[PDB]
Structures are given as C-alpha cells and as structure tokens.
Design an enzyme around this catalytic site. Structure first.
Site, PDB file in Angstrom:
ATOM      1  N   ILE A 175     -88.105   6.949  99.181  1.00 38.43           N
ATOM      2  CA  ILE A 175     -89.303   6.471  99.859  1.00 38.43           C
ATOM      3  C   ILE A 175     -89.208   6.696 101.368  1.00 38.43           C
ATOM      4  O   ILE A 175     -90.168   7.140 101.999  1.00 38.43           O
ATOM      5  CB  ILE A 175     -89.536   4.968  99.574  1.00 38.43           C
ATOM      6  CG1 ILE A 175     -89.899   4.778  98.097  1.00 38.43           C
ATOM      7  CG2 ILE A 175     -90.629   4.420 100.486  1.00 38.43           C
ATOM      8  CD1 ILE A 175     -90.093   3.336  97.682  1.00 38.43           C
ATOM      9  N   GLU A 231     -86.688   5.698 105.263  1.00 34.31           N
ATOM     10  CA  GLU A 231     -85.581   5.088 105.984  1.00 34.31           C
ATOM     11  C   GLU A 231     -86.020   3.756 106.589  1.00 34.31           C
ATOM     12  O   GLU A 231     -86.268   3.660 107.793  1.00 34.31           O
ATOM     13  CB  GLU A 231     -85.109   6.036 107.085  1.00 34.31           C
ATOM     14  CG  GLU A 231     -84.863   7.456 106.589  1.00 34.31           C
ATOM     15  CD  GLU A 231     -84.379   8.392 107.680  1.00 34.31           C
ATOM     16  OE1 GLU A 231     -85.094   8.553 108.695  1.00 34.31           O
ATOM     17  OE2 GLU A 231     -83.283   8.971 107.518  1.00 34.31           O
ATOM     18  N   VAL A 290     -81.738   2.910 103.717  1.00 35.80           N
ATOM     19  CA  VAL A 290     -82.484   3.875 102.915  1.00 35.80           C
ATOM     20  C   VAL A 290     -83.168   3.174 101.747  1.00 35.80           C
ATOM     21  O   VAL A 290     -82.610   2.255 101.152  1.00 35.80           O
ATOM     22  CB  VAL A 290     -81.552   4.954 102.326  1.00 35.80           C
ATOM     23  CG1 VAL A 290     -82.369   6.043 101.658  1.00 35.80           C
ATOM     24  CG2 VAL A 290     -80.676   5.533 103.412  1.00 35.80           C
ATOM     25  N   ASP A 333     -98.857   1.507 101.232  1.00 37.17           N
ATOM     26  CA  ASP A 333     -98.788   0.485 102.278  1.00 37.17           C
ATOM     27  C   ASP A 333    -100.072   0.543 103.102  1.00 37.17           C
ATOM     28  O   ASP A 333    -100.815   1.527 103.036  1.00 37.17           O
ATOM     29  CB  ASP A 333     -97.554   0.664 103.168  1.00 37.17           C
ATOM     30  CG  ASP A 333     -97.539   1.992 103.902  1.00 37.17           C
ATOM     31  OD1 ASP A 333     -98.404   2.207 104.781  1.00 37.17           O
ATOM     32  OD2 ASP A 333     -96.651   2.816 103.592  1.00 37.17           O
ATOM     33  N   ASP A 384     -91.361  -9.765 111.584  1.00 36.25           N
ATOM     34  CA  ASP A 384     -91.607  -8.350 111.884  1.00 36.25           C
ATOM     35  C   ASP A 384     -92.766  -7.760 111.082  1.00 36.25           C
ATOM     36  O   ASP A 384     -92.671  -6.665 110.516  1.00 36.25           O
ATOM     37  CB  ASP A 384     -90.327  -7.532 111.654  1.00 36.25           C
ATOM     38  CG  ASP A 384     -90.481  -6.082 112.078  1.00 36.25           C
ATOM     39  OD1 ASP A 384     -91.076  -5.825 113.151  1.00 36.25           O
ATOM     40  OD2 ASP A 384     -89.998  -5.196 111.340  1.00 36.25           O
ATOM     41  N   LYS A 414     -96.036  -5.806 110.217  1.00 39.30           N
ATOM     42  CA  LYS A 414     -96.668  -4.580 110.694  1.00 39.30           C
ATOM     43  C   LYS A 414     -97.357  -3.965 109.476  1.00 39.30           C
ATOM     44  O   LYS A 414     -97.030  -4.301 108.327  1.00 39.30           O
ATOM     45  CB  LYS A 414     -95.637  -3.613 111.289  1.00 39.30           C
ATOM     46  CG  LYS A 414     -94.427  -3.324 110.432  1.00 39.30           C
ATOM     47  CD  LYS A 414     -93.333  -2.667 111.302  1.00 39.30           C
ATOM     48  CE  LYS A 414     -92.000  -2.576 110.588  1.00 39.30           C
ATOM     49  NZ  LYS A 414     -90.945  -2.028 111.509  1.00 39.30           N
TER      50      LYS A 414
HETATM   51  N1  LIG Z   1     -91.603  -2.599  97.425  1.00 36.72           N
HETATM   52  C1  LIG Z   1     -92.032  -1.320  97.654  1.00 36.72           C
HETATM   53  O1  LIG Z   1     -92.704  -0.759  96.796  1.00 36.72           O
HETATM   54  C2  LIG Z   1     -91.697  -0.675  98.832  1.00 36.72           C
HETATM   55  C3  LIG Z   1     -90.499  -1.071  99.521  1.00 36.72           C
HETATM   56  C4  LIG Z   1     -90.088  -0.446 100.742  1.00 36.72           C
HETATM   57  N2  LIG Z   1     -89.002  -0.837 101.330  1.00 36.72           N
HETATM   58  O2  LIG Z   1     -88.846  -0.699 102.630  1.00 36.72           O
HETATM   59  O3  LIG Z   1     -88.032  -1.406 100.645  1.00 36.72           O
HETATM   60  C5  LIG Z   1     -90.893   0.610 101.288  1.00 36.72           C
HETATM   61  N3  LIG Z   1     -90.533   1.198 102.383  1.00 36.72           N
HETATM   62  C6  LIG Z   1     -91.435   1.318 103.555  1.00 36.72           C
HETATM   63  C7  LIG Z   1     -90.596   1.588 104.811  1.00 36.72           C
HETATM   64  N4  LIG Z   1     -91.192   0.942 105.957  1.00 36.72           N
HETATM   65  C8  LIG Z   1     -91.081  -0.485 106.277  1.00 36.72           C
HETATM   66  C9  LIG Z   1     -90.491  -0.671 107.682  1.00 36.72           C
HETATM   67  N5  LIG Z   1     -91.368  -0.040 108.655  1.00 36.72           N
HETATM   68  C10 LIG Z   1     -91.440   1.387 108.384  1.00 36.72           C
HETATM   69  C11 LIG Z   1     -92.012   1.619 106.968  1.00 36.72           C
HETATM   70  C12 LIG Z   1     -92.088   1.008 100.611  1.00 36.72           C
HETATM   71  C13 LIG Z   1     -92.513   0.376  99.379  1.00 36.72           C
HETATM   72  N6  LIG Z   1     -93.611   0.740  98.753  1.00 36.72           N
HETATM   73  C14 LIG Z   1     -94.762   1.471  99.373  1.00 36.72           C
HETATM   74  C15 LIG Z   1     -94.506   2.957  99.334  1.00 36.72           C
HETATM   75  C16 LIG Z   1     -94.206   3.642  98.153  1.00 36.72           C
HETATM   76  N7  LIG Z   1     -93.956   4.987  98.093  1.00 36.72           N
HETATM   77  C17 LIG Z   1     -94.011   5.660  99.279  1.00 36.72           C
HETATM   78  N8  LIG Z   1     -93.782   6.910  99.255  1.00 36.72           N
HETATM   79  N9  LIG Z   1     -94.295   5.101 100.488  1.00 36.72           N
HETATM   80  C18 LIG Z   1     -94.536   3.751 100.486  1.00 36.72           C
END
Ligand SMILES: NC(=O)c1cc([N+](=O)[O-])c(NCCN2CCNCC2)cc1NCc1cnc(N)nc1
Length: 293
Positions: free
Chosen positions: A10, A12, A16, A81, A122, A124
């Site tokens: 997904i 960083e 990760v 998101d 935090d 956002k």
């Molecule tokens: N619980 C979840 O489904 C989930 C958990 C995390 N995470 O971080 O465990 C995550 N990371 C986002 C990383 N950021 C957070 C901090 N600020 C920068 C962005 C994204 C998630 N889902 C949405 C998603 C699914 N797929 C793709 N490709 N993109 C997004």
C-alpha cells in the site's frame, strides 16, 4: 509470516504497509510493519488496549504481533482514503450532503474515542478511510503517541503540518481532545473549498498562515497564549479575516460550526459531542459516494 499472503504494498505509512490475505480465515487486511533497539514493552501494552476500542467509524485493530521483534499491526481493510477521493472529486467537488454525512460520522468517531480517553493527534485526509456504503472511518491514530513528531519515515518522508492545532505549534506539551477537533475543522474546510486551509511548509509558515487568516492570537481571545513555550512577542500582528471569505460558499450553519471548531483557546473549542448537536446537522443523511476502485 506464513499466515499472511502479501497482495500488494500500500505504501510507506508514518512503517511499511501491505494489503495481505490471511490464509486461515481468508480475510483481506492491512498489515503495518513498525520498525528501535528492543521494541518498548510499554507501547505493546498501550497498543493492546486499542484492540478493544470498537466503533463503526473507527478502523478496527484486529491484532498486534510482536514475534520476531518486528511489531505488526493488523487492521480491517478499506479500499480508499479521503485524500484520493477529494482529488478525484476536484472538478465537481464532493456534494454538500456527502460532506455533511462524513463530518457527522467523523464527529461520532471522535466523540467515542474521546469518551474513552483516546486521542488521535495526527488526523489528516490520508488517515480517513471510506467504503462503497457511504461510511468513513478514523485510522492510524499516530500509533498512540508511539512516535512523537515524525520528521522522517523509515525512508525520510515529509511530515504534513497542515492539520496541526496552534497549541501544538506553540510548544504545548500536553495535548487535549481539542487538537482533534482543530484537525477535523481543517479537513471540513478543505472538502468544501477543494483547497487546503493552511498549507504550511515549515512549522513557522504553518503558524503564520493560521495567524494571517484567523488573526494573531492575544490574551483576550486566548488567555495564556503569551506564556506558551514557543510564543514570541516578535510575532507579526495580523487582523482576522471573515469566514465568508475563507470557506465560500458555505452557508451560515456551516460557517458557525467551523468557527467553533477553529477557536484558538483549546478550552473554548467545541467538543465532538456538542458539535453533533449543531444546527448544521439538522438535515443530515447518508448518501452513497461514487467510488471507482
Ligand atoms: N486499513 C487500511 O485499509 C489501510 C491502512 C493503511 N495503513 O497506513 O496501515 C493505509 N495506509 C495509508 C498510508 N498513509 C497514512 C499516513 N499518511 C500518509 C498516507 C491505507 C489503508 N487503506 C486505504 C488504501 C488502500 N489501498 C491503497 N492502495 N491506498 C490506500
């Protein structure tokens, strides 16, 4: 481990993160690896407590795994998101009824966390996850203060200051539930105008962008501000701007609620519980979003 099957990476996160499948249950989850010289035992206990914090608008923490001394957090998976959704809706804008539904749901999530003495710290757009049914959920939580003010990720990443409350920027060491209301107010404004409210590129640029819009705070509107750790008598003195200019064309119900979410004094800032009762939500509904997965 061998219990999980990596589907994709997904990104960083603030470690990760992978989309993975549990071979046993067959469930698809988000697996976050948290990278350090022994992995604190005080954290694993605090984290373990969050496993019991269940609510429809909070991303479920399914498991915490310390084995191998790597520390993995397993979360329920959601496909998109709010940051990506806002970019996708840049041309036409998210409909007001959906903005209202999302804000209402996020306040319900915050009210629940705050009543259980849990702070996010935090918030956002990237930490707000949505699904096809019209739900939105609070995620990440900054890892429960596990990592204070992350300047760089495991690969050096630029920390977003855009949603930071003024008391944090002014060096207050004790955060209150009010910091989350401030962040959510900034997100509400961004959904409405389709532009970040305070896009600072340094701690001081962030603080000054806030002052240029809401006016430089003083003892009248924020008793005690001049005694804060990083307050400087040399800060420029800017006059406050009208909300009609800040989030047009949002109606007075919306402007009234936003103004209460952005009060300088954390003690005057509206609570999540009180915000749910604001007139802005008298006609709230739960629309279905147009999601392209
Ligand atoms: N619980 C979840 O489904 C989930 C958990 C995390 N995470 O971080 O465990 C995550 N990371 C986002 C990383 N950021 C957070 C901090 N600020 C920068 C962005 C994204 C998630 N889902 C949405 C998603 C699914 N797929 C793709 N490709 N993109 C997004």
């Amino acid at each position: 481990m061998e219990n999980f099957q990596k589907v994709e990476k997904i990104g960083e996160g603030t470690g990760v993160v992978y989309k993975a499948r549990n071979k046993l249950t067959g469930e698809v989850v988000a697996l976050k690896k948290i990278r350090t010289e022994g992995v604190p035992s005080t954290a694993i206990r605090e984290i373990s407590l969050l496993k019991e914090l269940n609510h429809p608008n909070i991303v479920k923490l399914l498991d915490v795994i310390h084995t191998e001394n790597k520390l993995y957090l397993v979360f329920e998976f959601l496909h998109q998101d709010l940051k990506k959704f806002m970019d996708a809706s840049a041309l036409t804008g998210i409909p007001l009824p959906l903005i209202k539904s999302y804000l209402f749901q996020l306040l319900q999530g915050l009210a629940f966390c705050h009543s259980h003495r849990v702070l996010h710290r935090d918030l956002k757009p990237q930490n707000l996850l949505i699904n096809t049914e019209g739900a939105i959920k609070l995620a990440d939580f900054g890892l429960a203060r596990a990592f204070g003010v992350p300047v760089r990720t495991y690969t050096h990443e630029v920390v977003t200051l855009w949603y930071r409350a003024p008391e944090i920027l002014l060096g207050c060491k004790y955060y209150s539930t009010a910091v989350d209301i401030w962040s959510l107010g900034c997100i509400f404004a961004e959904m409405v105008t389709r532009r970040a409210l305070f896009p600072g590129d340094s701690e001081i640029d962030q603080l000054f962008r806030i002052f240029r819009t809401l006016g430089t705070p003083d003892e009248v509107v924020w008793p005690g501000v001049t005694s804060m750790p990083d307050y400087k008598p040399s800060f420029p003195k800017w006059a406050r701007q009208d909300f009609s200019k800040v989030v047009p064309p949002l109606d007075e119900d919306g402007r009234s609620l936003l103004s209460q979410m952005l009060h300088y004094d954390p003690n005057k800032r509206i609570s999540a519980k009180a915000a749910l009762a604001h007139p802005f939500f008298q006609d709230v509904t739960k629309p279905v979003p147009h999601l392209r997965l």
